[PDB]
Design a protein around this ligand. Structure first.
Ligand SMILES: Nc1ncnc2c1ncn2[C@@H]1O[C@H](COP(=O)(O)OP(=O)(O)O)[C@@H](O)[C@H]1O
Ligand SMILES: Nc1ncnc2c1ncn2[C@@H]1O[C@H](COP(=O)(O)OP(=O)(O)O)[C@@H](O)[C@H]1O
Ligand SMILES: Nc1nc2c(ncn2[C@@H]2O[C@H](CO)[C@@H](O)[C@H]2O)c(=O)[nH]1
Ligand SMILES: Nc1nc2c(ncn2[C@@H]2O[C@H](CO)[C@@H](O)[C@H]2O)c(=O)[nH]1
Ligand SMILES: Nc1nc2c(ncn2[C@@H]2O[C@H](CO)[C@@H](O)[C@H]2O)c(=O)[nH]1
Ligand SMILES: Nc1nc2c(ncn2[C@@H]2O[C@H](CO)[C@@H](O)[C@H]2O)c(=O)[nH]1
Ligand SMILES: [K+]
Ligand SMILES: [K+]
Ligand SMILES: [K+]
Ligand SMILES: [K+]
Ligand SMILES: [K+]
Ligand SMILES: [Mg+2]
Ligand SMILES: [Mg+2]
Lengths: 383, 383
């Protein structure tokens, strides 16, 4: 009855640990996600195989990962829009993508293409920095016609990544994304945007601010992406600034924990039972126990905030940080879809089922689980 | 480092509720698994579509289900041997099979075939009886050459179903199964056999007894399959009889619960702390807290037994019984693979990591989880 829908560039992650000389030889920069040309991708790939450097291969992609993790956490249906090879051979990257993907992530609406899916070479340097080298293939060949209106109509949210606007001139993926947003507005489905790297956002932060104003209900980002978007180095102030443009903000801050900022109907606010925290906004967590509402659904919207430290107190061992923030987003999507199911099975129009503080606690536990494994994709739910 | 391997006939389950007149019109008998001819399968299928009777479609197959459930429970690798369409189109049954299958069930060793995978029409009658109509396609075209010796060599168990010997004359699947058993014996890998329906076993129980003697370490069955195999209507006596032929028996008994029978080194026996149960074997659970050992690894083998009632006391609602016993088997496979990992990461050579009583408790919880959903395949682990 309730489900979430996402658009991704269909990607398999190919992971390898490499030298600093490896990153330079293929024109990459540490900590970036960069699209590379086909001839560079082949030389890079051939060298990884030649030197037996590939450590893992698995379905990837920001939104693929997030829909996968949602369905693992909720054991409920998500729908992934994107491309898939029209003829899949055994053992191919497309074959692996299907096998790797969560059983409850519906892949029946992927659009056939006459070329390969994307490859993300996830390169870990000696210093521990992570770099993504993207060989797109046909991953940006999703057409607007292939966007099922009915799937978006019944969805609790439409989930997007900023990477979807990055493509070669004339490819249809940006147009397909805007068609899905059109449908979301038609059916009052909240649009979720997660940001992809500070460097990309920094290319044109003002364009992204206007995009958020125009189309986005829920924003997810880490503190560096937030600084690139808003100019605020303080995650709390960056989140508050972004509330000028969206309804609800998830801003993760690594070892500091994570922040949520949103709106609630002033009449319905709920004060916290935790000590009031100091910050750039004094006592910002005063109404942490409130549930989130879209701004338009409030007569007297009150801004509310929450912060929660990592599930992991102290410097407990991190196996691999890749994907931790997107895991926090998957927890939020679970709470939002739970609210949709509880509404159909029936006052104030809520956005989340739980309070900001409760959603933050859940997101923190999910992030921890992702930190304790190599993949950005969970394959079992929380204990 | 540790994994389990299974051989299945690659099958998608197509489920429908139908009338008693439907079962007769296609030559079926309630409660059976029957192979049907291609022209009958097409008429049966066309009628299910015409009358919009299909309620669910999902990857099926006894061993596919069990490898899937193992990997969901353990969040560890299983390997599935079998066939797969060589060219997979989007939306096809082969495409669905790959998407449905657990992320940690390795499907990279499936053998290409130039025809369709199997279809199991799972038909639920008005009276609640379940019938399986099998359209094999190329599911029995697995060749012995396609059995990876290295995969079996490092496995904690080779898992088979009695259905693997059912095929058309001249098809290679029986020979491929015997090749895998050959490798299992070569590397001292225990062979697991689960029985598929009382009616099939009853066709030649003595052949199955000799097969078990010759090749099988671990036997899994329900009480009706056990009666067909052994002639014993009492599940405890049927399990004890089967210990004449195998090392360890899992005999499930529906609302009565389930039984385990095995061997332990007499010196290493552990007495229970539960009240001694009456039965056809007096105080049969006296050494319930012992771990299981293969008979050949005992100098003084002692027969040990355990019984555990259902996790569900009382007549609590059952959503769908399909697959509950095979879920219990997946729990046992988890405990056996855990023992293999704990051995490599290091006395008596054990078969299970836990006692019979503990394995029975775990198997009962898994069965309950399968009873509380429609599919025989779990998509999330235990809480
Ligand atoms: N170094 C760390 N120590 C403890 N917790 C961490 C650490 N890095 C990430 N986390 C947890 O994972 C969450 C998301 O991490 P973050 O690095 O902010 O996201 P991203 O994956 O987007 O870079 C954090 O809110 C925190 O709970
Ligand atoms: N009617 C029932 N009531 C309670 N528990 C059940 C029932 N049917 C099955 N179970 C549970 O599921 C387990 C396996 O069920 P069973 O019907 O024996 O296996 P199969 O699926 O092979 O027919 C049982 O041991 C029991 O724990
Ligand atoms: N959609 C998409 N995901 C990306 C891109 N670059 C990196 N990622 C993914 O980001 C994930 C880590 O957060 C990896 O699984 C990558 O596949 C990109 O250009 N597009
Ligand atoms: N997200 C958000 N929307 C606002 C805010 N103030 C006004 N709006 C809405 O944004 C539009 C600009 O007037 C109108 O639809 C307003 O209702 C704000 O602080 N945050
Ligand atoms: N391998 C195999 N599984 C079967 C057969 N008949 C029924 N099943 C499966 O048994 C399961 C229920 O226990 C279903 O998922 C069916 O697909 C058969 O002939 N072969
Ligand atoms: N499973 C099992 N094997 C046995 C039993 N008794 C003897 N064997 C073995 O079966 C073979 C027949 O002698 C030999 O390998 C014996 O060690 C028994 O009760 N159960
Ligand atoms: K991000
Ligand atoms: K990770
Ligand atoms: K899958
Ligand atoms: K059975
Ligand atoms: K079931
Ligand atoms: Mg990080
Ligand atoms: Mg049953």
């Amino acid at each position: 009855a309730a489900w979430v829908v996402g658009i991704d560039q269909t990607l398999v992650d190919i992971e390898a640990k490499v030298d600093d000389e490896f990153i330079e030889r293929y024109g990459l920069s540490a900590g970036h996600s960069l699209v590379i040309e086909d001839d560079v991708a082949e030389a890079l790939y051939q060298e990884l195989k030649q030197k037996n450097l590939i450590t893992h291969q698995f379905a990837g992609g920001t939104i693929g990962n997030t829909m996968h993790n949602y369905s693992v956490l909720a054991d409920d249906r998500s729908v992934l829009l994107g491309v898939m090879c029209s003829n899949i051979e055994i053992g191919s990257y497309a074959y692996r993508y299907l096998c790797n993907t969560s059983s409850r992530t519906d892949l029946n609406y992927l659009q056939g293409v006459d070329g390969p899916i994307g490859r993300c070479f996830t390169l870990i340097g000696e210093s521990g920095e992570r770099t993504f080298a993207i060989s797109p293939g046909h991953m940006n060949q999703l057409r607007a016609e292939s966007i099922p209106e009915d799937v978006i109509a019944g969805a609790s949210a439409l989930v997007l990544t900023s990477y979807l606007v990055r493509c070669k001139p004339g490819e249809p993926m940006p147009e397909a994304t805007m068609k899905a947003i059109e449908y979301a507005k038609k059916y009052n489905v909240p649009v979720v945007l997660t940001l992809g790297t500070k460097f990309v956002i920094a290319e044109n932060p003002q364009w992204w601010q206007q995009f958020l104003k125009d189309h986005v209900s829920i924003l997810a980002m880490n503190e560096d992406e937030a600084e690139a978007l808003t100019g605020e180095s303080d995650p709390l102030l960056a989140s508050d600034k972004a509330l000028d443009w969206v309804d609800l903000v998830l801003c993760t801050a690594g070892p500091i924990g994570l922040y949520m900022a949103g709106f609630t109907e002033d009449e319905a606010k709920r004060k916290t039972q935790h000590p009031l925290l100091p910050g750039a906004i004094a006592e910002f967590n005063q109404y942490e126990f409130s549930r989130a509402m879209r701004h338009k659904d409030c007569q007297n919207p009150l801004r509310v905030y929450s912060h929660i430290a990592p599930y992991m107190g102290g410097p407990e061992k991190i196996m691999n940080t890749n994907g931790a923030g997107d895991g926090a987003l998957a927890a939020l999507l679970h709470d939002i879809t739970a609210n949709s199911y509880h509404r159909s099975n029936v006052k104030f129009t809520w956005l989340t089922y739980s309070s900001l503080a409760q959603v933050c606690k859940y997101a923190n536990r999910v992030s921890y689980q992702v930190l304790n494994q190599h993949s950005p994709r969970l394959t079992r739910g929380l204990p």
